[PDB]
């Protein structure tokens, strides 16, 4: 079905590197140079106050929409990944449900500016005080701290591509029917990532990467905060949250 479901040679691992990096370039949502160029474009004190004054439900809806757009690009990335379309429908769903948010959380470090602790949101950079209307300050501060720690690694685009392919192709997700097929694909993606790091003298990042439990905790925290919001505004979720967001998080 796919070469990467079996033992792969060095040449085939070198191709996997190129393939993953290409899949990522084509599905990235925003170019790194565009995000970097816009760093000087920061929300004014008046603009921040305006975001803080929005109703809780309006802020949640805007954030659920922006998240859904980012996730859509992660779905496209998954589809372009060697071997993903060869897995059964159950497993593709299992992988995307558990990993799509994790991939978005990793991709977000490109949009995070560690110099002033701001993130690119709705056309400009803003600090964590911009999301105060959500009423989930601990979750927001935990997300900014994660983006801050990832930023300290100075990831290249190729590294993010290879590391996110691995965040998604995780053979330990409960509910996988073809676990051994996913284990082999994960092994080959692990080799591709570690090969690229070896080749670029970047193996020192391996020890600095966050533990898998960190990404799981951030995703569980998001689902917990959504459940609190859902109990307060059930009609808002039902009527105005994107259907893809609800399939993944509700």
């Amino acid at each position: 079905e796919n070469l990467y479901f079996q033992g792969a040679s060095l040449t085939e691992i070198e191709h996997l590197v190129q393939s993953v990096c290409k899949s990522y370039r084509e599905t990235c949502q925003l170019r790194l140079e565009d995000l970097l160029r816009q760093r000087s474009n920061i929300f004014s004190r008046e603009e921040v106050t305006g975001y803080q004054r929005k109703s809780m439900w309006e802020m949640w809806e805007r954030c659920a929409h922006h998240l859904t757009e980012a996730i859509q690009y992660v779905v496209e990335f998954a589809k372009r990944l060697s071997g993903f379309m060869e897995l059964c429908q159950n497993d593709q769903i299992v992988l995307l449900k558990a990993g799509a948010m994790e991939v978005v959380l990793v991709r977000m470090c490109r949009a995070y500016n560690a110099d002033n602790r701001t993130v690119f949101f709705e056309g400009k950079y803003g600090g964590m005080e911009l999301f105060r209307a959500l009423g989930c300050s601990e979750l927001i501060s935990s997300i900014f701290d994660f983006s801050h720690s990832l930023s300290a690694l100075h990831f290249s685009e190729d590294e993010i591509a290879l590391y996110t392919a691995l965040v998604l192709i995780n053979a330990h997700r409960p509910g996988l029917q073809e676990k051994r097929k996913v284990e082999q694909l994960q092994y080959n993606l692990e080799l591709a990532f570690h090969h690229h790091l070896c080749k670029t003298h970047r193996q020192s990042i391996l020890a600095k990467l966050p533990p898998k439990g960190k990404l799981r905790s951030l995703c569980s925290q998001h689902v917990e905060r959504l459940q609190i919001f859902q109990h307060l505004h059930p009609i808002v979720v039902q009527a105005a949250f994107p259907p893809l967001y609800k399939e993944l998080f509700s």
Binding site: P243, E247, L248
Partner: peptide, 12 residues
């Protein structure tokens, strides 16, 4: 249901 997810995966 996973209606949207199924649709996204089957759209070539």
């Amino acid at each position: 249901k996973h209606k949207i997810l199924h649709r996204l995966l089957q759209d070539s």
